[PDB]
């Protein structure tokens, strides 16, 4: 893309240790509007993009999490489709959650990635390597982000997230010829 | 600045839901029941907002349970719904609140919604609400019902009383 | 411009297509292959102020489903023809039905089987995400897309082209 | 573009992915992981239009539903293939079936798993939100975007390349 090609010299720099992605779901892996029914079951949509780029994203050997204060099974059920390896929902102490589950993963912060949209993102985002934010995000998070999406959450920004790591990491030209025939 | 000064006196914050609280778009199942849609960035914005001590309402033409629910979710406190009649609604609650027009701050979207945005302290109106609408009211948010209007309000208002920095320390620490 | 407000004048119809009009276009499908559909609040307080005014209205759409019926009956529209391919057949009989000649009626639509009829009315209108076509053989297109609040545009045309559309306003400056 | 109505010429099988071609790319889930999906209005007729004047369609998807099996059938959509993500070997099946060649497809796509196709093809063209990457590497790019009538604009290409749009636009002005 433009965006991976006019990537940077800071967040080329700030994606190369990178083991870790995480990604919050409301208004990042979706466009952030909340749809529900009469019975309050609620419906989440996401994006066709974005799988696409989680998948060669974990292909290329970085892990990823998902970190939400909201929680319902409809996510649950995406993360796993995915292959997303660590999954906490209804957990609004974001940074309580990331550093247990680096402790156990033996990482440090620059080596973790997060794509978030508001507020509770924000004590994660100004602590990880590459903290991001979606292009429609809460501006004060926007202002305190390392770099912000092109897209906004929900149309592709998880997709854009992934390539920026992907190209970083000098992994996305292998990714891209899979499918294009004598890149 | 004239939206700051009326967003000071507020203790007040009424909104409408149609339009809104949502997009304007209504979803009918076959057997007519309804889908609703909401935004995550106006409900951290209500929450910030009813935490800086300033309470909230909602009044609406139409009724729904999905309203209903929505509303406790956020905590707002006082819940309004198939009133064609604003003005006489918000009359009843100010008398319980012993409030008056100038400490109250409302963001509409319709005609139904002027009688009051023309009376209030800080009457607002949603990007693409009607045209006639943005006209008679003070002010008018850049982002559309449903997609971040309320929380564009709600920062109005706590930026106006000096809470914004506050809300917003507690993630900064 | 002054010629819409010029061919809002004789109204006494205003007929709407369905989806893409009324709605954004979208049709929505469920596994078990029942519909959802969409409509907007701006438009339900046009088309009751259109309504109110004494211009009656009509929907003519190519689809069926018990949703638009119901939206129908909520707004107080008062001729309902769904599953109708033929939209010109079937304005030539209702139109026979209240005594009216085509340009005493408005049409707003979206796509081709719409034009036989907006070609034929006395102010034919196409929404701003109308096929090109239409849009192109149309006597003029709303700012507003299809479920955006075209149809209040629409609407808001017509009582303005007649003078109405002030009263309906003042109203709303009262109190109560 | 005169290269685009050149390669419409000798189409005789159009072809479309789904989600992000004749959607807008959201995927809906409930609760209970039953889906939603959304159409537009403007593609059916376009479909239909283009079938009409002789063009074969199909649709190659990576995932799959019965929402698409009732779309397609109700468009008149005779060859369906869904949870393919090997999307050539499918197409080169369908051909050797009906007797054509690359020459004579388009196909439009949204994503990687397209690109294969697009790149062999008479006329491969991409949505206007289509992967970049993508755009990049396609005969062309539909103005509009998935699921806002980019299936719509990609059939009437074909069809006026074909000196068959014009006829089409007729039925609707006697
Ligand atoms: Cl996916
Ligand atoms: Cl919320
Ligand atoms: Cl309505
Ligand atoms: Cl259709």
């Given at each position: 893309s433009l965006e991976t090609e006019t990537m940077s010299q800071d967040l080329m720099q700030r994606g190369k240790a990178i083991k870790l992605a995480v990604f919050d779901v409301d208004?990042?892996?979706?466009?952030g509007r909340l749809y529900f029914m009469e019975d309050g079951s609620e419906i989440k949509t996401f994006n066709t993009l974005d799988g696409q780029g989680i998948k060669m994203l974990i292909a290329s050997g970085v892990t990823t999490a998902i970190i939400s204060g909201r929680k319902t099974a409809i996510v649950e059920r995406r993360a796993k489709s995915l292959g997303i390896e660590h999954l906490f929902q209804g957990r609004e102490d974001k940074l309580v959650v990331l550093d247990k589950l680096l402790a156990e993963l033996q990482?440090?912060?620059?080596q973790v990635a997060y794509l978030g949209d508001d507020l509770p993102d924000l004590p994660v985002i100004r602590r990880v390597g590459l903290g991001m934010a979606v292009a429609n995000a809460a501006s004060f998070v926007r202002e305190h982000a390392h770099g912000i999406t092109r897209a906004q959450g929900g149309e592709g920004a998880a997709r854009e997230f992934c390539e920026l790591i992907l190209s970083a990491q000098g992994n996305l030209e292998a990714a891209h010829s899979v499918y294009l025939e004598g890149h």
């Open positions: 208004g990042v892996l979706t466009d990482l440090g912060y620059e």
